[PDB]
Scaffold this motif. Structure first.
Motif, PDB file in Angstrom:
ATOM      1  N   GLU B 138     -22.023 -40.088 -25.895  1.00 29.79           N
ATOM      2  CA  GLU B 138     -20.584 -40.239 -25.693  1.00 29.79           C
ATOM      3  C   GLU B 138     -20.064 -41.494 -26.392  1.00 29.79           C
ATOM      4  O   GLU B 138     -19.065 -41.464 -27.090  1.00 29.79           O
ATOM      5  N   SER B 146     -12.386 -41.564 -22.839  1.00 27.24           N
ATOM      6  CA  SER B 146     -13.321 -41.704 -21.725  1.00 27.24           C
ATOM      7  C   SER B 146     -13.883 -43.103 -21.682  1.00 27.24           C
ATOM      8  O   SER B 146     -13.769 -43.848 -22.654  1.00 27.24           O
ATOM      9  N   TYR B 147     -14.521 -43.455 -20.581  1.00 32.95           N
ATOM     10  CA  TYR B 147     -14.947 -44.829 -20.411  1.00 32.95           C
ATOM     11  C   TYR B 147     -15.794 -45.273 -21.576  1.00 32.95           C
ATOM     12  O   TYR B 147     -15.434 -46.271 -22.213  1.00 32.95           O
ATOM     13  N   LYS B 195     -30.014 -31.080 -23.194  1.00 34.35           N
ATOM     14  CA  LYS B 195     -28.855 -30.356 -22.661  1.00 34.35           C
ATOM     15  C   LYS B 195     -27.595 -31.204 -22.528  1.00 34.35           C
ATOM     16  O   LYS B 195     -26.556 -30.822 -23.028  1.00 34.35           O
ATOM     17  N   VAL B 196     -27.651 -32.315 -21.790  1.00 40.15           N
ATOM     18  CA  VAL B 196     -26.452 -33.121 -21.550  1.00 40.15           C
ATOM     19  C   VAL B 196     -25.967 -33.772 -22.874  1.00 40.15           C
ATOM     20  O   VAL B 196     -24.776 -33.946 -23.090  1.00 40.15           O
ATOM     21  N   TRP B 199     -24.133 -31.076 -24.738  1.00 39.07           N
ATOM     22  CA  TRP B 199     -22.869 -30.821 -24.026  1.00 39.07           C
ATOM     23  C   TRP B 199     -21.777 -31.876 -24.347  1.00 39.07           C
ATOM     24  O   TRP B 199     -20.605 -31.525 -24.427  1.00 39.07           O
TER      25      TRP B 199
ATOM     26  N   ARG C  10     -14.161 -39.865 -17.066  1.00 45.69           N
ATOM     27  CA  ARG C  10     -15.501 -39.329 -17.352  1.00 45.69           C
ATOM     28  C   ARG C  10     -15.471 -37.975 -18.061  1.00 45.69           C
ATOM     29  O   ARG C  10     -14.545 -37.176 -17.862  1.00 45.69           O
ATOM     30  N   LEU C  11     -16.458 -37.736 -18.937  1.00 45.55           N
ATOM     31  CA  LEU C  11     -16.723 -36.396 -19.472  1.00 45.55           C
ATOM     32  C   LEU C  11     -17.473 -35.639 -18.376  1.00 45.55           C
ATOM     33  O   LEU C  11     -18.631 -35.965 -18.031  1.00 45.55           O
ATOM     34  N   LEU C  13     -19.435 -32.731 -17.864  1.00 45.62           N
ATOM     35  CA  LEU C  13     -20.199 -31.744 -18.661  1.00 45.62           C
ATOM     36  C   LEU C  13     -20.202 -30.316 -18.059  1.00 45.62           C
ATOM     37  O   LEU C  13     -20.423 -29.318 -18.782  1.00 45.62           O
ATOM     38  N   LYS C  16     -16.599 -29.109 -19.147  1.00 42.21           N
ATOM     39  CA  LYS C  16     -16.169 -29.662 -20.422  1.00 42.21           C
ATOM     40  C   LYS C  16     -14.713 -30.166 -20.352  1.00 42.21           C
ATOM     41  O   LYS C  16     -13.859 -29.783 -21.177  1.00 42.21           O
ATOM     42  N   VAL C  18     -12.102 -33.750 -19.156  1.00 43.70           N
ATOM     43  CA  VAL C  18     -12.023 -35.144 -18.822  1.00 43.70           C
ATOM     44  C   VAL C  18     -11.565 -35.254 -17.373  1.00 43.70           C
ATOM     45  O   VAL C  18     -10.501 -34.749 -17.031  1.00 43.70           O
ATOM     46  N   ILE C  98     -26.374 -29.255 -14.766  1.00 48.65           N
ATOM     47  CA  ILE C  98     -26.676 -30.595 -15.167  1.00 48.65           C
ATOM     48  C   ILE C  98     -27.876 -30.962 -14.308  1.00 48.65           C
ATOM     49  O   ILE C  98     -27.829 -30.788 -13.085  1.00 48.65           O
TER      50      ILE C  98
END
Ligand SMILES: *[C@H]1O[C@@H](CO)[C@H](O)[C@H]1O
Ligand SMILES: *[C@H]1O[C@@H](CO)[C@H](O)[C@H]1O
Lengths: 497, 497, 167
Positions: B138, B146-147, B195-196, B199, C10-11, C13, C16, C18, C98
């Motif tokens: 990210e 996002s943060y 995976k994450v 994503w 935050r994303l 997941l 998908k 925010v 997740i």
């Protein structure tokens, strides 16, 4: 148009003639009414059909797997040897037949000798295990001076059979197999059998069983585990594949050999994985010990009553397209001559077979007989790497399917080069051009073609409309073979001098 | 005498340029004193040595793995981003050094931009896991909003780094790794991390770690298990290999590339086993993301005291025989261009490196610089299948070692064919004849040679006895290139038109 | 939780999206009070584990006198939410979840989470996750393994089912 480079120095490998092997099981009419029919006017002194003998000889089958197959997994070898009055009638649970054991291993050896084939003998690791494995090897291979060797002599067979290549069971990965085993159970018993068999006669080779089919839920996992258990004691791993045109899709059907090519590569990769895990210097090769078309006879089989003697099972009647597919599989086996050292057309007589017989009647050649004969007779030598540029097509399950399936095999000793080639094109001829500068002073001997306008046309006892001719137009000028491959044709272009 | 067919239509594959990648770890002086030395006369405004920058550009390295290596398995990425005052000093357990973190990921990307290389970023799966893995993807790749993306912006990097290719940890099969994991443990965490990560950004591709070494007791088993756990979520599996001449046997040492060949083939076969086991249509390729000679510095490193900043570790000084082996390794990579798509000379600067520096001093080229430069600059295009016929020899650990290690690379766009060739012969020249009939109108452009009488001769800051010359005698006449390869030589024969 | 200014974006997941976090657990309890419903609170056992599980039970349920209980008070909720029924993660049998876990892995972490949660507050009851779906390849096997690991510490196992008329 398609091109090919036939260069002598781009070699795959010397072809092991055992890729032209076959297989007879105690199943249906393969033995009883197949190779053996005491009643028959053409039967020899020991009850073997001379007509079938001649037909097998013409195929030049070097090795025949026997006696199974699913049959062996419930079979006691001692029941087929010695005086016939002491041989018991058994319930074969594999094919739900009564087996009389009128033919057992010594009579089968006698038959194999008539057709000039060695026997790839299988031991039962379904209801039996290591003791029976070693004892069978001693009975067959130890000269004399022990109970079992002296037993073979007492049974009328003084010289050892000296069987070279043994199968450690039949595929027991399936829930339909007698004495099914998981891959750890099988690998363990195969290991211990392999050891004792080899201690009786260290000149032998061992084939461990791969998966019964590539669709099995345990495919690949099986082979890896089995080899992990057996690698040091064995020589080959087997694979098995049957094809069928169940949804009438000719273009897709003919593409199936691309799957076979991948299946082979997969199993080679497993062997090489295990090789590397064990740090072994030995390479394990493949025995493709069951391959054919098999589908035509599925519905008729469902109605056979259990507990008959020699029921008419698995009697597919092959058509012309089946012959083109068999041709494509043969080319595929040749393409992997570096790693596929044994293969067996399943099976040789009556049972999904190139040779069919009728009771007290004729033996005749199915469509698939021809491409098999051609491969076996003209495909001894070095398989050369095909560098093909060919047009291509997409089908339901495949993409980039070449219209041209082809390979050349060069025999240094006969000074010949044979080009096997299938035109998969359903509509148009293919103009093949082959660059043969690497070969000086060669000419076209002939160009053989198997072609029929109707893909579903079969052969039969009374007429064979599907038969090769020798009127292919291949010509060689300035270091180049040009040849027209008719639509849906199998082609054998032979070169010499 | 040796021959070689250079046939344009016998192709292995297009070479992926990333087989010319390298690697920088937070190790030794690779970073501090290497790429980065404030107040060096040639330091730019960000502290990066300009001489080092020009040396890397000359190599044309397209991708550079960072930041580890054993270092990443104990590293918190957050410790190397943001204002330097808030960056903590850490005990790096990998190399027993104090890491000040004055360089971290944003400064490394700044440097990577200068040399024109993308970055193969590695995430810590030793002490850390899936949460850190997603947060780093990210931080690096998500635009804003996002943060962690805004945090990158705030740190002074408004546009995303947009890193394409990530390493899921470093090899943790070893007992010497921080946060060692069994193949199952690593497989499960690599799976969930992959995976994450994907994503956050589906454009990325993932490299799962193979064995740290071919000699590991879990070799091959590791790869198969790891792939069983991760196949669907990853794109590449890695392999690592270092070579050394600790027993002073040149003949055996130059043959070590035959072992790398077998190793590549093994890992490919494992990938293809797991593919078949999963019935996947996706092919997994290899990232050979550590390779090099490494041994000369082993003894000096033992005397370095724990807990210094930027100790002079892994500073091998290569010799000429080392360049010949590196040459053989590069040819071996090209020979596997169909399956090895990334590769990383470990490492780029100071640490087992083709480029060495001195504090406030010069930067210079080790012997191994030259074959790598030649391979990178002239080895773009399609690797052709070498059909060679060479005399051969036996060494301690190998049989039938070709005196000639060679491949040709065809660049159709530049209309050039480059032949790379080593002559391993320690006494005799090798007369190479190359059949180039399939390249009409091609001429010799030049014949580069790297040779030296003393195999143990090294280069230094002060002199370079080991440099290429262009006095190679390659000539075209009658559709054939004839070239004299001196004993113990690396040769680049360039043809064009 | 806490002042909105310090709540990060935050994303997510899962979907998908925010997630601004402008709503979190204290505001949700505020809403739940309006509709007269208790809350079946779920703890993250995907990316997180037993430490977060105990800290969230403390934050929600313990009166005062510890860091997390006083923290809730400070956030503006003096009385404990006193949540009775908790979910030990969400179904993680799926490859799309997740922090997917095998039945053994999930079973072991659910077990240790259930313990520390009930030690903070023995009045709670725990729901262990069953299969995300009846058609999962691990269906039934999952439940038996999960229960083998957690039986003594849990009160309920879940099941999930959706239907559709696509044909
Ligand atoms: C392969 O299929 C049948 C018939 O060929 C055999 O019994 C077997 O193992
Ligand atoms: C491979 O070897 C070392 C140095 O290159 C790295 O830390 C590693 O993973």
């Amino acid at each position: 148009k398609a091109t090919m480079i036939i260069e002598k120095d781009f070699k795959i490998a010397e072809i092991d003639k055992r890729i032209y092997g076959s297989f007879i099981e105690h199943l249906g009419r393969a033995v009883y009414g197949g190779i053996y029919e005491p009643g028959h006017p053409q039967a020899d002194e020991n009850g073997f059909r001379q007509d079938v003998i001649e037909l097998v000889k013409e195929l030049q089958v070097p090795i025949i797997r026997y006696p199974g197959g699913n049959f062996v997994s419930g079979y006691n070898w001692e029941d087929g040897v010695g005086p016939k009055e002491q041989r018991p009638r058994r319930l074969d649970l594999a094919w739900k037949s009564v087996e009389t054991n009128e033919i057992g291993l010594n009579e089968f050896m006698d038959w194999a000798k008539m057709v000039g084939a060695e026997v790839n003998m299988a031991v039962n690791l379904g209801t039996r295990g290591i003791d029976a494995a070693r004892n069978l090897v001693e009975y067959c291979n130890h000269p004399s001076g022990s109970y079992y060797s002296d037993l073979r002599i007492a049974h009328g067979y003084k010289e050892p059979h000296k069987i070279k290549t043994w199968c450690l069971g039949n595929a027991m990965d399936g829930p339909w197999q007698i004495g099914h085993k998981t891959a750890v159970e099988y690998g363990r018993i195969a290991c211990e059998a392999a050891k004792v068999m080899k201690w009786v006669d260290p000149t032998i080779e061992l084939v461990v069983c791969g998966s019964s089919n590539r669709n099995m839920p345990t495919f690949a996992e099986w082979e890896a585990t089995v080899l992990d258990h057996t690698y040091d004691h064995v020589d080959y791993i087997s694979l098995h594949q049957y094809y069928g045109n169940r949804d009438n899709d000719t273009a897709n059907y003919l593409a199936l050999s691309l799957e076979m090519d991948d299946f082979i590569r997969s199993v080679v990769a497993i062997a090489d994985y295990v090789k590397a895990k064990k740090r072994s210097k030995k390479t394990i090769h493949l025995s493709f010990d069951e391959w054919n078309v098999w589908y035509h006879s599925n519905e008729a089989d469902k109605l056979i009553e259990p507990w008959t003697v020699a029921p008419p099972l698995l009697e597919d009647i092959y058509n012309f397209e089946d012959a083109l597919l068999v041709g494509c599989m043969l080319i595929t086996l040749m393409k992997h001559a570096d790693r596929v050292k044994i293969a067996c057309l399943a099976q040789l007589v009556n049972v999904i077979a190139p040779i069919m017989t009728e009771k007290n009647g004729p033996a005749w050649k199915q469509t698939i007989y021809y491409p098999f004969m051609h491969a076996s007779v003209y495909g001894r030598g070095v398989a050369l790497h095909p560098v093909i540029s060919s047009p291509k097509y997409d089908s339901k399950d495949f993409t980039d399917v070449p219209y041209l399936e082809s390979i050349a095999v060069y025999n240094e000793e006969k000074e010949e080069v044979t080009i096997f080639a299938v035109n998969r094109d359903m509509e148009d001829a293919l103009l093949l051009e082959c660059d043969v500068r690497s070969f000086e002073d060669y000419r076209v001997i002939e160009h053989i073609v198997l072609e029929h306008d109707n893909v579903k046309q079969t052969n039969s006892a009374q007429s064979s409309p599907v038969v090769p001719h020798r009127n292919g137009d291949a010509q060689l000028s300035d270091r180049k073979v040009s040849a027209t491959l008719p639509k849906l044709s199998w082609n054998v272009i032979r070169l010499g001098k």
